[PDB]
């Protein structure tokens, strides 16, 4: 509709519909970043819709790559993506983006990150999907029953000379 201009005043392509379709056809969410890279190279900066699609692919994708990658985390990738969007692109995440993050936290069983995201949605957005808040609490209380509330080695009593400093 309205032409966008870049930092130096040159115009940027705004027709970012085909790229979203490409993102919605990926198998592993690392391939989504490649699409974002191609968009930037083609002077087609992503919009809010593009980032949400990327988050959706991350949540719905099996893994980062065809082969496993050590210490890979879906939550970390999405949060970094949001950091890029808000800080280095000046775009405010909407409710949809945070919901995807909350779904990932619930799905992965990380019930402590869910609490933080729950407050974020209750602070920036308007509340949280009460379906997901309840799911996270269920995961937390399962840990209490099973005893996996904190890593066990932390609970072990220690002393001044009883700590192994690697």
């Amino acid at each position: 509709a309205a032409k966008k201009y870049d930092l130096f005043g040159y115009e940027v392509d705004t027709n970012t519909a085909p790229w979203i379709e490409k993102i919605k056809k990926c198998k592993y969410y690392d391939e989504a970043g490649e699409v974002l890279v191609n968009m930037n190279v083609s002077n087609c900066p992503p919009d809010i819709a593009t980032y949400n699609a990327t988050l959706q692919c991350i949540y719905q994708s099996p893994s980062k790559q065809s082969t496993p990658v050590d210490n890979e985390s879906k939550f970390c990738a999405m949060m970094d993506l949001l950091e890029e969007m808000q800080h280095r692109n000046r775009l405010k995440p909407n409710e949809e983006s945070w919901t995807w993050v909350m779904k990932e936290c619930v799905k992965s069983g990380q019930f402590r990150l869910g609490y933080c995201i729950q407050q974020v949605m209750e602070t920036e957005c308007k509340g949280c999907p009460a379906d997901l808040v309840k799911a996270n609490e269920a995961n937390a209380q399962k840990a209490k029953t099973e005893g996996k509330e904190h890593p066990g080695h932390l609970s072990q009593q220690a002393g001044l000379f009883d700590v192994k400093v690697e």
Partner: protein, 523 residues
């Protein structure tokens, strides 16, 4: 249908690692700064680079390989093209020469490209975490920046750069490959053993998957040492022009200048200051101008440069050292006296500077860095000219700056915040590292069953990105952050410091001394 080369003359003279050519009458002729092949055998060729074109028709050649095979009278063929080397993701995890030949271990990019235009760049706004608290706070580095590392021999110039490469391993594994930081480590005039030791060190931490090594050892001719930085940056410009970020380390430019001096003098170039060629500034100037932060319109990729430079007796008045300092956007000065004084990394904050400023810091680090900067400034002056708050916290900040391995962002920022808000005022300076170790690798609240926080715990490594988004001084994270620090301080003082201050036995004293020294090398 023949593989017809372009013969341009014969080899006239050979002087070490350089040669001269005489053109055969009535031949096409060779172009300046092009690659030529000296036919050492009907099937074997030695690479050379054109450097001079004299009135007599004679040609100055810089030999690159198979020098021992070169003899006077051999034929020379002209490719007619500049130097191009392999580039791509298929080179990562490998050791290569400036010519692209792989070195066994136990797309073509032009090496003479021009730097990005003025309107092809963007302001530096993305941080590059070295992993060291001193640098990340007081000497910010941003992607697309040239940060010199100047110091004396045996001061940590190589270690800090290698640690910076390693610190990206953990980050790259979690975030998308879009924001991953690739590494090009260039060794110039170094020992072959050191390269192997570096290769093993990178492999141990798994950094080879995101890193490649370009080596021109001492035994190799000066030509390779002269082209290594240009070849290395070329491999890093592949990612820059494709919306990705790279980090190029040059170890070190000091030995590159010597090689260029050797080549110029042998080829009858007039010497200049300290016998260096007149155009020695222009050599590094065009090398470091190629490291930039491309604009949104060209992809947003970047190349970050960490050239290393050696001084003699902490003399930064030398020729090449001054030239490089007048080129880079900042300098990290490693001081010998601090290094021997126990401060490691021996970063001299007074002599170090980053011209990018806070723009190359994350929103979370800006507030901590800004306030930390004022305290240290007062601390430097107070002692130079009384337990005032600036002097109480300044010493503890200095103690927290001693490190041996790069630190995760979450661990470093939290510790700095604690020391900033006075949580370490009651902690003795000697025990600061021990306090930090327990905070990071332990949780006193859980140990003593007094932890009421819901999510904020130091063992939840995923909190790093939430901190990096919202800041520590935000209502989401601030309330629980203070509670955890308050509990950790109270528990630490009560259960640990009291016993530590009550030790008199020689056996216990020695045991404590070992513990605290180990804590320095652990966190």
């Amino acid at each position: 249908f023949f593989k017809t080369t372009e013969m341009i003359g014969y080899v006239h003279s050979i002087d070490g690692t350089i040669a001269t050519l005489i053109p055969a009458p009535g031949n096409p002729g060779v172009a300046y700064n092009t690659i030529i092949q000296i036919q050492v055998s009907p099937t074997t060729f030695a690479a050379g680079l054109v450097f001079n074109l004299e009135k007599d028709g004679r040609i100055g050649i810089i030999l690159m390989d198979n020098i021992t095979e070169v003899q006077s009278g051999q034929k020379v063929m002209a490719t007619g093209q500049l130097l191009h080397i392999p580039v791509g993701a298929g080179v990562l995890g490998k050791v290569v020469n400036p010519l692209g030949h792989e070195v066994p271990v136990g797309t073509l990019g032009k090496v003479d490209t021009g730097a990005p235009n003025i309107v092809s760049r963007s302001p530096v706004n993305y941080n590059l975490l070295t992993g060291f608290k001193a640098v990340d706070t007081m000497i910010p580095i941003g992607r697309g920046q040239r940060e010199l590392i100047v110091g004396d021999r045996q001061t940590g110039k190589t270690s800090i750069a290698v640690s910076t490469i390693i610190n990206q391993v953990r980050i790259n594994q979690q975030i998308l490959s879009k924001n991953a930081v690739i590494s090009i480590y260039v060794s110039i005039g170094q020992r072959c053993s050191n390269v192997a030791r570096i290769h093993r060190l990178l492999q141990s931490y798994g950094a080879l998957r995101y890193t490649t090594v370009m080596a021109a050892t001492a035994a190799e001719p000066a030509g390779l040492q002269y082209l290594a930085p240009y070849a290395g940056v070329t491999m890093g410009e592949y990612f820059m022009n494709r919306g990705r970020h790279c980090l190029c380390v040059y170890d070190d430019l000091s030995k590159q200048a010597v090689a260029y001096r050797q080549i110029s003098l042998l080829l009858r170039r007039p010497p200049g200051r300290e016998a260096y060629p007149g155009d020695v500034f222009y050599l590094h100037s065009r090398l470091l101008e190629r490291a930039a932060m491309l604009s949104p319109g060209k992809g947003g990729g970047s190349v970050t440069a960490l050239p290393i430079v050696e001084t003699l007796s902490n003399d930064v008045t030398a020729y090449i050292v001054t030239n490089v300092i007048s080129i880079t956007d900042g300098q990290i000065y490693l001081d010998t006296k601090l290094f021997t004084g126990g401060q490691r990394p021996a970063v001299n904050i007074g002599l170090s500077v980053s011209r990018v400023g806070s723009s190359a810091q994350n929103a979370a680090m800006k507030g901590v860095a800004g306030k930390l900067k004022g305290i240290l400034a007062e601390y430097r002056k107070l002692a130079a000219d009384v337990q005032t708050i600036p002097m109480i916290r300044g010493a503890r900040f200095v103690a927290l700056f001693n490190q041996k391995q790069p630190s995760y962002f979450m661990n470093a920022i939290v510790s700095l915040y604690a020391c900033l808000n006075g949580y370490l005022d009651d902690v003795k300076v000697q025990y600061v590292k021990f306090y930090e170790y327990l905070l990071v690798h332990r949780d006193l609240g859980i140990m003593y069953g007094t932890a009421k926080n819901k999510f904020f715990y130091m063992y939840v490594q995923e909190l790093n990105y939430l901190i990096r988004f919202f800041t520590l001084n935000s209502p989401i994270l601030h309330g629980e952050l203070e509670e955890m620090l308050k509990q950790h301080t109270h528990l630490f003082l009560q259960h640990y410091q009291s016993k530590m201050n009550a030790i008199k036995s020689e056996k216990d004293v020695k045991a404590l001394k070992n513990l605290l020294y180990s804590c320095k090398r652990a966190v």
